[PDB]
Amino acid sequence: EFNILLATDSYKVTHYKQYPPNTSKVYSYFECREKKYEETVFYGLQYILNKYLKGKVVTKEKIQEAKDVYKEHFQDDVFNEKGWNYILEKYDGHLPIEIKAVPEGFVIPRGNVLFTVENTDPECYWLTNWIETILVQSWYPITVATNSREQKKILAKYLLETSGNLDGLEYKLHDFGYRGVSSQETAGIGASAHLVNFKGTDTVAGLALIKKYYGTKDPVPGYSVPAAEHSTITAWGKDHEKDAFEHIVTQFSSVPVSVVSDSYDIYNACEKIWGEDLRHLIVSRSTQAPLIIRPDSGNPLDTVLKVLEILGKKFPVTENSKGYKLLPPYLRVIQGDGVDINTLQEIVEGMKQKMWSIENIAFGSGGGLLQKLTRDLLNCSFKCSYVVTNGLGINVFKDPVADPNKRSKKGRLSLHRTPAGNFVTLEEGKGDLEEYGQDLLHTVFKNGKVTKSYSFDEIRKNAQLNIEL
Template sequence: MRLNVNKIILSTLIWLSARWVADTSPLCAFVPQVTHYKQYPPNTSKVYSYFECRETRTEPTKNRKVKYDKTVFYGLQYILHKYLKGKVVTPEKIQEAKEVYREHFQDDVFNEKGWNYILEKYDGHLPIEIKAVPEGSVIPRGNVLFTVESTDPECYWLTNWVETILVQIWYPITVATNSREQKKILAKFLLETSGNLTGLELKLHDFGYRGVSSQETAGIGASAHLVNFKGTDTVAGIGVIKKYYGTKDPVPGFSVPAAEHSTITAWGKDHEKDAFEHIIKQFPNVPVSGGEDLRSLIVSRSADAPLVVRPDSGDPLDTVLKVLEILGKKFPPTENSLGYRVLPPYIRVIQGDGTVGVCVGVGCFKRLRVQPDLNQPASTHTPTEAFLIY
């Protein structure tokens, strides 16, 4: 995936706006900022602010050391295009904000005059300037990631008004940074056990769609994961990438057909084998003739369409090893050039339940690596060629 970073390096005056569904500009600020225009020193003409990922934690009761010393800058372009671009202010939005804040404060403290000034002079566009490092950059903590400043002396108060929207970039930055750190772990053990990085971009798969707070959260978080990887079951992220970033790839993320509890248990307790045979036949990618048994159906699959076994219960460290041991007895592995056993290309293992990010990733890889009698997932062809640590 290639991000169109040119669109977000904003070095000249841009007029920004937001649209109101739940986010009209006069109503999308942290409440104290509504009255800040009255609190600046007299004759203030410009406010200049910046955003960084702090070098240390601010909570005195916690370990002040941060988890990672670098962060991946991602997500600003989405915010600018979705919320801060085009015409933002209308008479209706000003009136709505005036009424909401009057009720909220029980006083007329809303800066109606300031917003009407923007409406009349700039046709509802916000006179602020934003400069940023290119998205996708890996930046040491404590460095400026983007700056914001007002460009009209009458609108000095506007700079920090947009802070509430802009600081929401913490979420895609966090996801992209965590994803990158896990990618580094995967790369380390992939090199140690296979000698190359083939398929690395497909080794960490996003299963998070059902575990987030909203559709928008899903899109933002999944798109941040796609900065580092191409495997995702959260299709909302693909929409964000295509709409707000653009990519030369027709689809920036990929997945495969997969079963769940309901599609297996629906066959009944005594028909689990029938369920698997049926599913394999539904998605063959290879010719299937009548009368074949389950094992031959699996063996006949190509390396580009393997059967992927996804264990769902138990301790992931123990379960993955047990599954590999069982599969190794039924589908004899081969030994790669580094002495690790590799399952045949038509069958793979993916772990997506009960994992704990980096810690489980390191533990699982180390345990697989030090036990040569077990079957080490290989790096060869597909997005599901190795167990997944998420």
């Protein structure tokens, strides 16, 4: 079972003897540090608060376990048993902590305070940065949600240009990354973050997380349709790729179905099998049940363009009102190999130059969507900005001589609307001057309790694109 006394960086175990004597208060903040990605979606803290921080997180057994572990780990007795016992005895194991945060789903420019942390008991000054490590893992849902949102922007732009509307946008980037993430837990968290912007997912773990920690009006937040894999085609034998195709589209004849077509020869499969041998089973399909062809190898733009040209000559293509070419409603394409934000952009622009509508295509992304991301992408960072020692409050910060981008903020922080309606972070307690209206941060955690929360439906609303609004 999870033990919060064992969920921090090792060295922080030793930090309580390192602060100045008579320190009563430690106050720290989290930001996506300013240096693409000018704005970030704040999402994920509510999960961490509820799964890891709330309630009785400290027991005698957990204290003893950590004591035993750290003695061997440090080859010495440095663990703060006394501090942790004080929490157990005074607050029934509830963390004397207050956390303030911007609403989840909010889109905020880099360089702004997103949440703040401080101790509510003078004895528990060391506690603020104990929980840095667990809290800083919010970088991941923030970064997935943000990067996913950036991709939706690109998809909106081109769909709008080639089609004149945004129908189907929310199904244009599907989550394929379940097998490509580092763990089950990462799968659920990451899948949940993508669903801030889209509705298509194959990462089932995300559904349960949302249900448990956020909630939706609808039964589920994410959806999928039947589809083949290489094993359901190749199992028929190299000489029976037509038989496999036919069985599969017949099994799923009244619902949408995606069929990977590159097991042996994508171009042959599209031109001869789909476009000639099995054409009669495709053109009979309902507009609500298209066949979605899936190429899965070769240069991503080159293959997409060639697949489209092949189908364009085997099937009746129309020209939409924008002058762009459109496959018939029963036939679509999904590119789910080598898709990340850069290649996605390359494909839609290449499609546009060849006069293909973005209506024709959908994308699947795996590692690119959920795994190929790090904390330094948005520079998610947690730092101390204010301490009270000997009854005096001190504005504190780092400011390394060789890197000004690592300079941290000073003093008590607050977030505000500017007269132009933008965000500004005020430092040095300056928000108390009331020259910038009310602090936009809300108290979301205090003394073991989650004090403010948001539904997944509201998070989605907050994270909408300007074009959508």
